Amino acid sequence: MKIKIVPAVGGGSPLELEVAPNATVGAVRTKVCAMKKLPPDTTRLTYKGRALKDTETLESLGVADGDKFVLITRTVG
């Protein structure tokens, strides 16, 4: 239904958004890696404290309201 995301960049804070029942943790991760233009060594997603990607669909097991995602990033200068 609605989900929350916590990107650890630019003064990171939680944000709500509505998503499709066919959404997938790996597809959320790869969109952010592509949008940040950074490899999976320096940008990663977590869900319920686990690393996840190969979920295929949440709705085939049981999709819900208020599920929460944390997106971690790295940089050097």
Distance CA 63, CA 7 (A): 22
How was this one solved?
NMR
CA–CA gap between residue 77 and residue 69 (Å, rounded): 27
N-terminal to C-terminal alpha carbon distance within the chain:
39
How far apart are the C-alpha atoms of 64 and 47, rounded to whole Å?
Answer: 13
Count up the domains in the chain and report the number: 1
Q: Domain of 40?
A: 1-77
What's the CA angle centered on 8, arms 69 and 20, to 5 degrees?
Answer: 30
What is the spatial distance between Cα 9 and Cα 37, in angstroms, rounded to a whole number? 14
- Measured distance CA(41)–CA(73) in Å, rounded: 9
- CA distances to 36, 45, 59, 73 from 10, in Å: 12, 17, 32, 11
